[PDB]
Structure formats: structure tokens, C-alpha cells
Design a protein around this ligand. Structure first.
Ligand SMILES: [Cl-]
Ligand code: NI
Length: 191
């Protein structure tokens, strides 16, 4: 699992040569489609996606294809002739409370991050700016702001959602997740 998921886990950030990921993202299409959190990219003048390879980190410019503001998601497209290993959208699954999940990300240096945890709720609200997002998952697999925008997966490596790190009233990092089904239904006008 920790061998076959990371290639589809990317870093997302601005276009500066000396800039690193400020969030994570999930490759969901062979021609370079990436799902990430909307608030992470919406104010970036230019978007660069950082991809792990056997030769080290490669960067690709990306454009926003579609915003999903009501769920704080963005669909990006990398501008490249290259093909990518990716999450299969047909393999997307739901999870239930108590089920073990794994939250993947990439840090500011391009290194992979993974944490496992349990689903703790399957219906939780979250406010992102002025948007009230509903029917999110909660899990303790999300421990770092750097995991935001990265994928939640089940033990089989199926994409189950996109993570959002939120702050509690006390500063404790709390883990939220947009269910992957939201991607499918809000993107039935692209690929
Ligand atoms: Cl929406
Ligand atoms: Ni919706």
C-alpha cells in the first residue's frame, strides 16, 4: 500500500522556482488531472504540481479546470505531454465509522507523508471561509496542514476522499475528508 499509492500523491503550490508544496493533491487521470483543495490554490497567481519520480521531483504547471466551491475542491490539469499513474475513479469506495483509512500527502520538500487512522464520523460539518461544507468524514489520519488536499484511501488503496486539515477551538489539528463520490458527481461534465 505504502509502495503503490504515493506515485499518485502530489504536492501543489505556486510557480516560483524556489517554492515548495503548500498543499497536497491526488492524480485522478492518466493525462494529468489532479484533485486538490480549492482554498489552497484559488489565490495562487500560478500553480505548479510537484510529482515524485525515480529521478527526483518533477514540476508541471497546472490550470484550474473546474472549481467545486461547495466542497472546497478544485480539478487541475497539468500542462504536459507525459502520462501518470493515477487513482482509478471507477475504484472509488465509501468508508464507514471504525474503518481503517490512510491519509497521504507530500511535505514542503517533496517527501511523502502517510498516516493511518480510523474513520470517526461519516457526517460532519466544516466551515471553510464563508462556505459551510456538510456531510464530511472525520478521521484522525489527518494530523498535518501539509496533508490538506491529499487523498484518503482504504486498505486496498482505493480513493475514498480528499483531506482537509482544520483547526479546533484549542488549536488541535482535526481531520476532515470530502467523500470521493463528490468528485464523481460534480465532474460529470469533464472526463
Ligand atoms: Cl459545488
Ligand atoms: Ni454538492
Amino acid at each position: 500500500l505504502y509502495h503503490t499509492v504515493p506515485p499518485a500523491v502530489v504536492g501543489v503550490g505556486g510557480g516560483g522556482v524556489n517554492a515548495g508544496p503548500v498543499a497536497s493533491g491526488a492524480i485522478v487521470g492518466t493525462n494529468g488531472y489532479v484533485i486538490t483543495t480549492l482554498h489552497s490554490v484559488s489565490k495562487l497567481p500560478e500553480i505548479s504540481v510537484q510529482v515524485a519520480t525515480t529521478g527526483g521531483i518533477r514540476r508541471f504547471p497546472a490550470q484550474v479546470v473546474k472549481t467545486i466551491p461547495g466542497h472546497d475542491l478544485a480539478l487541475l490539469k497539468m500542462q504536459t505531454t507525459e502520462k501518470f499513474l493515477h487513482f482509478r475513479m471507477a475504484d472509488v469506495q465509501t468508508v464507514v465509522p471504525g474503518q481503517q483509512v490512510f491519509a497521504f500527502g507530500r511535505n514542503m520538500a517533496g517527501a511523502p507523508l502517510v498516516r493511518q487512522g480510523l474513520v470517526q464520523s461519516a457526517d460532519a460539518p466544516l466551515a471553510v471561509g464563508a462556505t459551510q461544507i456538510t456531510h464530511l468524514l472525520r478521521s484522525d489520519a489527518v494530523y498535518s496542514w501539509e496533508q490538506t488536499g491529499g487523498p484518503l484511501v482504504n486498505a486496498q488503496g482505493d480513493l475514498v476522499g480528499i483531506n482537509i486539515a482544520a483547526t479546533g477551538p484549542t488549536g488541535k489539528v482535526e481531520g476532515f475528508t470530502v467523500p470521493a463520490q463528490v468528485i464523481v458527481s460534480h465532474l460529470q461534465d469533464v472526463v
